Design a protein around this motif. Sequence first.
Motif, mmCIF file in Angstrom:
data_model
loop_
_atom_site.group_PDB
_atom_site.id
_atom_site.type_symbol
_atom_site.label_atom_id
_atom_site.label_comp_id
_atom_site.label_asym_id
_atom_site.label_seq_id
_atom_site.Cartn_x
_atom_site.Cartn_y
_atom_site.Cartn_z
ATOM 1 N N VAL A 5 0.863 -1.176 0.000
ATOM 2 C CA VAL A 5 0.000 0.000 0.000
ATOM 3 C C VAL A 5 0.900 1.226 0.000
ATOM 4 N N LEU A 6 0.825 2.020 -1.062
ATOM 5 C CA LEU A 6 1.699 3.173 -1.237
ATOM 6 C C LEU A 6 0.907 4.457 -1.042
ATOM 7 N N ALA A 7 1.362 5.297 -0.112
ATOM 8 C CA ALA A 7 0.813 6.643 -0.012
ATOM 9 C C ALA A 7 1.116 7.441 -1.271
ATOM 10 N N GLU A 8 2.260 7.179 -1.897
ATOM 11 C CA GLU A 8 2.638 7.828 -3.142
ATOM 12 C C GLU A 8 3.799 7.054 -3.740
ATOM 13 N N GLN A 9 3.969 7.210 -5.047
ATOM 14 C CA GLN A 9 5.126 6.665 -5.733
ATOM 15 C C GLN A 9 5.434 7.561 -6.916
ATOM 16 N N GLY A 10 6.652 7.440 -7.419
ATOM 17 C CA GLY A 10 6.991 8.174 -8.616
ATOM 18 C C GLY A 10 8.477 8.121 -8.875
ATOM 19 N N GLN A 51 8.992 5.023 -3.415
ATOM 20 C CA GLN A 51 7.725 4.446 -2.982
ATOM 21 C C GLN A 51 7.587 4.707 -1.493
#
Lengths: 349, 350
Positions: A5-10, A51
């Motif tokens: 479960v990712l709060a955000e990635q990039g 991530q």
Amino acid sequence: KRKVVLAEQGSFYIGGRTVTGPGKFDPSKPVIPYSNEGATFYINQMYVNFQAPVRPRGLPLVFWHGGGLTGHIWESTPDGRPGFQTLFVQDRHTVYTIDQPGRGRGNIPTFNGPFGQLEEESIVNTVTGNSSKEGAWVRDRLGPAPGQFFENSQFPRGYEDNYFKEMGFSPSISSDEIVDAVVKLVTHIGPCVLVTHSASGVLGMRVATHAKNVRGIVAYEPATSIFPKGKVPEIPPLADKKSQIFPPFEIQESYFKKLAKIPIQFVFGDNIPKNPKSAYWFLDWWRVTRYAHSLSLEAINKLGGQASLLDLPTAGLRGNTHFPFTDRNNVQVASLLSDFLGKHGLDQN
Amino acid sequence: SKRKVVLAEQGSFYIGGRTVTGPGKFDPSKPVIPYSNEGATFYINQMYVNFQAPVRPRGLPLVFWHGGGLTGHIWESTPDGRPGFQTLFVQDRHTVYTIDQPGRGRGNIPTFNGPFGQLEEESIVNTVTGNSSKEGAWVRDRLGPAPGQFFENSQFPRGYEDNYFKEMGFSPSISSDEIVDAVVKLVTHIGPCVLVTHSASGVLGMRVATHAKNVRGIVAYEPATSIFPKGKVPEIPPLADKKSQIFPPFEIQESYFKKLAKIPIQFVFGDNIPKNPKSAYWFLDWWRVTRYAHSLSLEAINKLGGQASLLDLPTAGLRGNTHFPFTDRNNVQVASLLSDFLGKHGLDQN
């Protein structure tokens, strides 16, 4: 578990410089075939992938691939099991994985002309070097000769092609420019932990001496030892009485002393011989290289440091290769990394 | 803006490629460094593949295939750090594959011990490289008519020029056949899927579909090279400078071309492609004639019974898109149009 479960990635690019060709650019003239005329080229930039879990705990981890590799080695094992990226997001750390300048999604500096040449200037050498499968097999201690495995090996057998396909050449970018890119990343991230491998071992040590935000280092089988300038101890040649290990890197003592201010752990796998092995060059190379690192860690501890060498067999893990974090027991390897982070408070906010 | 993503699983792997060999035998007692070609096996032309699978996917996996000189980064994030199509389409309940094709990014760059690309007497790829400048890319991508200039309506993430141009680089001279081959192998591995291509990978994706029935749809963002049945390339004018031409159209046997008529295909074009000749702006004029050639290619597919269409983003109400609509400031609206295409053809249902 494979779920994350990712709060955000990039991902993003950081670091690098520009070089310029002669003349000026005219948009009315044919743009293809591409020309150096009027050209600005961005060179030596680094690719960074992040991530972040929900509710991170402790410092972000920056995973830095070894020589000729990419961030793939932290994403998955050759047989498709989760890599340290997934494992440590699950362990509630934000995880950065990089492709350093000259590797993978990092920049390979070449232009219109012979490889690496911008008009009369050599940015990187046209002549490359690159290991064969055979050279990598013995370097990585899958076994003593290509095609042969140590009986205890943790390598994911049957996935040899997948494994060797991840490796490639590196152009002759100066190590200074590689360190510079990672220093800039560390400035951007804030306090963090470097997790390095093989060629990035010495580079991460250098980054820490330039970046107080590096709060700890775990290095898997670093390839080049580091010592204060003029204080390289006597290191023997290999058993062939001809060859040497990689020349130790020397840094000014005022920088070297910064290594004593953070916890540092070097991790070694299995099947490194205790005694000279003239028949097996890379096995013997690892014997002497590990010895040199023991002296480097000792020098850090004599400056008040907390630098340790973890031999995985002493922790009960047998058969690890030069890539313990992709071996069959990589979950157990990861547990030992979590233990290090926890003891040093790097897993708490 | 909406950043959370939940993955049932993620990972990456290598697929495709071949091996080449050096002369002689490898002796483990001899110094291994400096590296030698003696007794060497080299893996070359393999492809890197990343996957992210949502919980309970709905519809077919998407394979995002970067344009020329790019990598899967362009699907991960925009230059200003907003979510790319990888995140958006995992959130849209598709498993998402992003590739670095052979010769780019984490794909293999085939070089050895010797001058770049040379394995002893065999030239695997050329030692002489080519690579666009920032200036060439600025006009190719239609940020504006000249470097430093932006079109009035621009959707480019202005201020992030450094991040954007840093993502681009050279490609060695790997045969296009071997790039197509790697993606055919991936499509065999994953099963029925949709190819989402860009620029140079436009024509390569069309070729893959003719060799892989598992390709159930194509969406191509501004493909760079048109494709036609062999011997049936229509008249295509030269550029306004009276001397230049667009990329020579790729010709395939009619029995292969006909397979393109069996699946939905959409080409998507952004803004600021001129309607009339522009002799002062080579790349703008190049895009005018290239878009025209693609319109004829799509018509040829439709005359064979196909389901091919051209979506001009301005016609859909989106103004100012560049050659990378999926990283522009309105990329969420661009993504919505891709979701619309997938939904129209049931590619978002099990």
